């Protein structure tokens with residue numbers, strides 16, 4: 787998925803001298819890559835004690851300067867604003883519209899004026915009835931309808947196979963969440979390769 791990574795790095799653009807906050811950072815893969823492209827500062831946040839422990843361990847192996855915090859994005863307080871916030875596969879862990887809105891509000895509160903959010907999530911549009919994504923390597927096992935989205939149980943065709951639950955919020959739910967948070971504008975980023983897929987989201991503060 788080169789164009790996914792390309793779009794992701796295109797969505798972020800130039801990071802030279804930019805402060806980056808990596809939300810749902812895991813062991814800090816993405817923030818670390820932006821550290822090597824000349825980010826002035828990188829901070830990582832994840833809700834998992836396990837992931838942040840492994841992140842700090844990896845930073846030791848790399849001898850990098852990256853700061854890691856255990857926090858829920860919905861109520862995190864770093865007492866600092868950043869040029870760029872990355873939130874790849876964070877928002878489909880939001881179990882409610884209120885939680886989704888909490889997360890966007892928290893992102894906005896940590897953005898410098900004219901700062902941008904770069905996100906990637908399960909396509910808001912996707913409905914099971916349209917067709918399953920076996921070809922893409924993602925098996926949709928169950929669909930539970932929510933007010934303004936769906937709960938999807940997804941099996942990734944791996945060995946062993948693993949089952950993930952996505953809260954797939956529709957475009958309108960996202961638009962309202964982005965609006966309430968006080969973003970100036972945003973757009974959906976959906977690349978098309980020549981010779982089911984996840985969607986990018988870029989949001990700019992005034």
Ligand SMILES: Nc1ncnc2c1ncn2[C@@H]1O[C@H](CSCC[C@H](N)C(=O)O)[C@@H](O)[C@H]1O
Nearest residue numbers: 810811812832833834837858859874875879
């Ligand atoms: N409310 C929340 N706040 C912060 N991190 C969260 C969260 N809910 C889930 N996460 C974290 O989100 C991560 C998703 S997997 C890692 C995603 C990573 N940004 C990437 O693109 O590769 C998990 O590590 C999980 O612990």
